[PDB]
Design an enzyme around this catalytic site. Sequence first.
Site, PDB file in Angstrom:
ATOM      1  CB  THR G   1      -0.943   0.043   1.220  1.00 22.92           C
ATOM      2  OG1 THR G   1      -1.727  -1.156   1.266  1.00 22.92           O
ATOM      3  CG2 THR G   1      -1.871   1.239   1.127  1.00 22.92           C
ATOM      4  CB  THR G   2       2.419   3.172   2.766  1.00 22.64           C
ATOM      5  OG1 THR G   2       1.166   3.110   3.463  1.00 22.64           O
ATOM      6  CG2 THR G   2       2.984   4.581   2.891  1.00 22.64           C
ATOM      7  CB  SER G  46      -0.675   1.421  -4.435  1.00 19.08           C
ATOM      8  OG  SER G  46       0.302   1.259  -3.423  1.00 19.08           O
TER       9      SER G  46
END
Lengths: 240, 129, 232, 228, 238, 146, 191, 240
Positions: G1-2, G46
């Site tokens: 994600t990040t 992502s």
Amino acid sequence: SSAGFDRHITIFSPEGRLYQVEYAFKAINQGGLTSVAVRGKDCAVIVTQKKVPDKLLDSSTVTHLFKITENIGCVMTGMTADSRSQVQRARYEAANWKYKYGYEIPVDMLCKRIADISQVYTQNAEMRPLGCCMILIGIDEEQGPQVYKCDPAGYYCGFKATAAGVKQTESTSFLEKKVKKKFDWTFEQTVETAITCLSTVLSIDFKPSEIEVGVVTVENPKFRILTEAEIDAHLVALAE
Amino acid sequence: LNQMDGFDTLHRVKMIMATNRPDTLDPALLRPGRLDRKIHIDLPNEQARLDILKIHAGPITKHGEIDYEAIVKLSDGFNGADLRNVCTEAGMFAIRADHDFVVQEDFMKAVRKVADSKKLESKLDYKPV
Amino acid sequence: ERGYSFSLTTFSPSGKLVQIEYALAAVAGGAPSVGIKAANGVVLATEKKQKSILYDERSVHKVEPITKHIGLVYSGMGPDYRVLVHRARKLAQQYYLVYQEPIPTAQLVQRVASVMQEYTQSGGVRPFGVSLLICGWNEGRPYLFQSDPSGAYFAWKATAMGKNYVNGKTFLEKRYNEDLELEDAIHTAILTLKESFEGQMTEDNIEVGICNEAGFRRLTPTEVKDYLAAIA
Amino acid sequence: YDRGVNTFSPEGRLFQVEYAIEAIKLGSTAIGIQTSEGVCLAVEKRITSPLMEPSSIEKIVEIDAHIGCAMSGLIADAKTLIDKARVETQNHWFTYNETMTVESVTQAVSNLALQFGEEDSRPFGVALLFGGVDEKGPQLFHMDPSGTFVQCDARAIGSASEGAQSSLQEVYHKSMTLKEAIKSSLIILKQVMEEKLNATNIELATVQPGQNFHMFTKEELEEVIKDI
Amino acid sequence: NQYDNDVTVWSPQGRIHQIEYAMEAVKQGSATVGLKSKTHAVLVALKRAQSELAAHQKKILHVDNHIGISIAGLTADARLLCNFMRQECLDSRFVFDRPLPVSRLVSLIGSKTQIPTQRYGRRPYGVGLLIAGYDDMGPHIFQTCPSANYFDCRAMSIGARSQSARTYLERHMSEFMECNLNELVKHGLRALRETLPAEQDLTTKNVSIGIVGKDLEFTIYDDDDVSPFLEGLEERPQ
Amino acid sequence: KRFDSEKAGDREVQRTMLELLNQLDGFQPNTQVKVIAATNRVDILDPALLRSGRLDRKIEFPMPNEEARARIMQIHSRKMNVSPDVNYEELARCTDDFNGAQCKAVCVEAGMIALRRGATELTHEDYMEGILEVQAKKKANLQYYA
Amino acid sequence: TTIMAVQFDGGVVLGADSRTTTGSYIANRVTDKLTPIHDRIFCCRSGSAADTQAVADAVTYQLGFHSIELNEPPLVHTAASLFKEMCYRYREDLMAGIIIAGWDPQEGGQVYSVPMGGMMVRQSFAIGGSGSSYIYGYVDATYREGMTKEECLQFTANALALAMERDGSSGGVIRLAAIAESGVERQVLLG
Amino acid sequence: TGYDLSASTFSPDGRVFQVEYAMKAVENSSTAIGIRCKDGVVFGVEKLVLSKLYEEGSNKRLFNVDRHVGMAVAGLLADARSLADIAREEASNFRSNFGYNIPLKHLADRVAMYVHAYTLYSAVRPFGCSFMLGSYSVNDGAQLYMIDPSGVSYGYWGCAIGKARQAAKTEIEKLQMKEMTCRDIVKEVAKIIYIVHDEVKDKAFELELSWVGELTNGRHEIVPKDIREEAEKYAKESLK
């Protein structure tokens, strides 16, 4: 023993022959070149010379050895443009192998595909047979080094030490005598032979600049083009 | 053929034969006995071309500067004849320059160009064995 | 292409097909090969000899099994052969996807026979120069079939393709017969392919594929020199 | 020398097209006339046997209201040009709510005159003559297989074309009157026919600004015969 | 001569005879001479008819306000490439809302005529096109050929004995860049008038004239329009 | 030299040609009396003909140029009476693919129709006329190109 | 994600989290968002995972073929350019959490950003994912120009740590990628 | 007999005469040469004045394919303009998918692939064109490539096309490739082109010089002949 368009197109003669492909196999010798392939125990060596008529020629542009993939090198014969088209078809199809299957191509199946493509080139009567010849190398799992030769008959095959072209028919006759005996092969042994066979066929005994040595080994599995320096080292090494 | 099929001893007589094409000669002549040996001339290597060029540079008076590797680099695939006619072409082109001794720059020019004209007229030099 | 696509094969004054005749001649100039269907299953024995001792026979095979129960050999020209083999290889699958079941020998010969048929009449392209010998074992009883450039097919207990195939054909007529075991079929197949073979025979000079009713199998040079050592 | 049917002559031009120019020389001969009073055109049917029904032969059909036409040589090749030209005029009436001028039908045909080829089929062997009345009045036109167009006053086609154009330009002028041009034309027609003149042998194509349509009919023609 | 079959074949000397025979198709058309000054550009063409009452067949035809063309050869390809020409005009005239610079236009003519000059079973176009137009750099006179190689001139000519028109051109054509429209036009008909055998005019209806200028829109002139241009002429000597 | 048996009926003649190559090969004395040869087409040759004693200086003779064409044609017409108005430039450019011999034919035709004209002296319209006469051929008709 | 990409002097530094889940369920405890397109160029992804894998494999194909034809190393801007092309082309269909960075022989370390809209921009550093939301404000004032490789590694480790601490999606473990002339160096950290 | 017709057909000698004819047809065009210096590449063309015929500055065989890449062509002119559209669009594609200057090698390789692809089929004809290609960049340097109607793509420091070819590229050995600056090679090639091509062969002609390299900052255009005007000044005095 010929009737009709059979000399102009691809069909069968009264005896079953087709003149186009036999015009191709002698359409290779227009280049006046020499292709030499030698396979060692852990290594595989390619060597080819070149002709430099003008001082305006760039030594880097006329190099006849082409790197298809990181582990896969090749050498062509015959006319040039056919060889290049073959080369982009090769590289292209390798990349399609990596896209479809995700692992590296054994290069044998590459000779199969390129071969079948050559057969499609022989089939259509309104298309030209494309008379350039192709030789490859590479490394496979537990197969060590390999050599393969694709010719414009629509077929492929590969052996220990193989050569095809102008003066290569006698170089096979020198070769079989060099390979056996019982001869075992090191790296510098197969390089040294790579020079010798072409020498005894030509006996020019010349600068390392004219020949180009392609190599593959299982130490560095990647294909490599030799620099003239190390080549000259092997050249003063084979002269005792 | 029947006098080489003897019935006779030809040990003491020698026979030398020269022709354009070793094709129409029939298997009878191609057969040993009658014709024991087979030897050919081939297009001279740049080494031999160099040498014959040397001996052809002798009779012609030249300028102090001479470099044979120029003509050896330029001249490829000529007959030995075509090479000596190339030297004569150099000199007879140099009768225009009226110089007694002639530079090999004029030889590079006329030799090179007219030689390549000979190679444009070199059609169908490829013969059987 | 250019869309010309006119069939180059017309009918002779007698109605014969010139290019198909010539392709039959090219097959006749093919490599000597044989196959025998008897008893337990089919045994195919071809001949592959190197023009030079540089060649390596561990690389390319003359025998390319279509499925675990069905193999195949040939005579004539490999370039075409490999092509139509890739074709039939792909073709058996659609049959599988439909029925989820191995395709019967007869049906293979049917569809490949049609491919070759239309391939003759197809637009502006020569026929093949290959005559196939197909083996297979299905429903307890094995089968041996033969193709031709025109697409027609037959069935034999034993036959031959290539040079001398009439001579060795008559040899197989007399000697081979009845139904005999894989050992016998292999024996007489090594005799009849030993007829036109060169002065020396080795494990790499020939290739022997066998169709058991347990499934097709390709023999290695190991067993090839094992049974033939001791040739015939 | 069989070459591509699209090949130019060494002089030169297209073979098959220049031959199609000769294809008209044998067809049925006709003569049109453009005169300020109106366009009058005429053709000989060239009838063979009593089997041959005389009204079934028409070398003249009226394309539009104000546009007639004549043909030559081959016929069913002309049928397509005729019908499709009617379609073109009617679509012109679609867009522009008017009458497609006689001159624009010309190029609306001769622009598609030569489309023929193999890849990407045979040229048409029929000459045409365009009668009609546009805003400038009577117009007689002439076109050829190759698409080359020229506007005429009194034009001939067919076998008689040459001598009929000679004797025609002999008898013509710009002060002509309608029936004068009619009978003067059928004079040449009855010099160029092998069989004697009757009601069946010919048909007249006539168009005038306010006299229409017309077309034309027999039993007027059957009177014009004896009017000689 | 069997190697002159189709366009595809290169001759033993390397010259496709199809394009040569198309040139010879161009040479049969009626002579016409286009020319320009440092300001104005003029083309002059002579009609030919089949018979008396048959209309003298026109050559000069209008295309766009700033660009007209002359013509010779097949009328079919003439009207065809003319239509493609109208298209090209209203193209930039539509999207860009500007006129068309002649140069890139004629390169579009070369690209359109190129492909039929090569593909198997194709022909070139019999073309006598002479183009006159004004972009921001003013006058232009181009010319075409069946081989699709165009030239930019002060004056050129095609057709029958149009090289004689050039033999009139060379002398005064250094002066053609100076004088205004009228006497330039009479220079033009002085170029065409030698294409006729010396025993006939050079009348009104048999000739077509077209002029375009810097601020002058391209207009065709024939008959009563050329009567001022045809008057005040000295007859050729004998 | 043809190719292969049988038979070259000239095999004896071309054999005598190879005998000329022997008089130029195994024997030097031909160094005197230079022998010159000419051929309209170089298509077929003895490939051994390349040598200084054999065929050496080899020159392609092209089509003459408009300068040279009008020059040589002017040499053919220099004896005849010509009205002193001739471009030689106009017709020099009107000479396309011509052989100089067809320029001679242009002069000869100039005299020919110069006869039927009755004009005592040759004119330029006569020149361009004869040009059209000999080349290029005929005929068809003037049409379709307007 | 990040995801996080920072260029230092001799090259660039990449890092990302591992945990990738669907809704409430914890799907994969460890998942690598760094994809080795070429030896000197990575990318961090992502959004929808399948779209990122497919596009990355496709540009690996076209890119590898192109560079094999070049006989030369590829450019970072050339690698991001294809992502811009295919993204903007399908920008209606797919999702782009793609950020690309790598060391180049000519230009050294470079970073390029590709958001969902399909645009391409080069920054001194880049950030993406749902976890970056809370870390914008921290990482903006925490950043300093002239970062050496170590300060980059420790920096990105802090940023990703805070990310994974607050947001529920970003979680699991942390993978780091150090790309320079000396070659790619990776590791996995916790704490 | 029929072996010259189709490019799809081979010949008893194993080559195509369509390519031979097309090749020697290119030899009839006017001589246009090229050369590369250390800081760029110098194109040069000799355009002939036939009759008048028409305005100077027309149908120049010097083209501009890209911002940094242009043409110097010879042979059939229409097909050469077509090739200029080809390479133009190809550089537009490279610019499209990538966005920087196309490396000359790949551009010449694509044009070579087309030129090759039209030599295999009787649908089209072999191209009647041969042209010079040159480019410059700071990450590359000055590269020159020479392409033939057969499709062979390699490179030189200098090359010669047109009627006068070997006798023109002969004394180019006196021009030094690196040592000589491009502003001097302007007047060098001026003196070659003016000194070669004897005025009797063609009564009048002119000289065109296009240039690309470092002095113009990668921009390829005609270094203006009214700029420096050094040909005439030097070349007129250079005849002796």
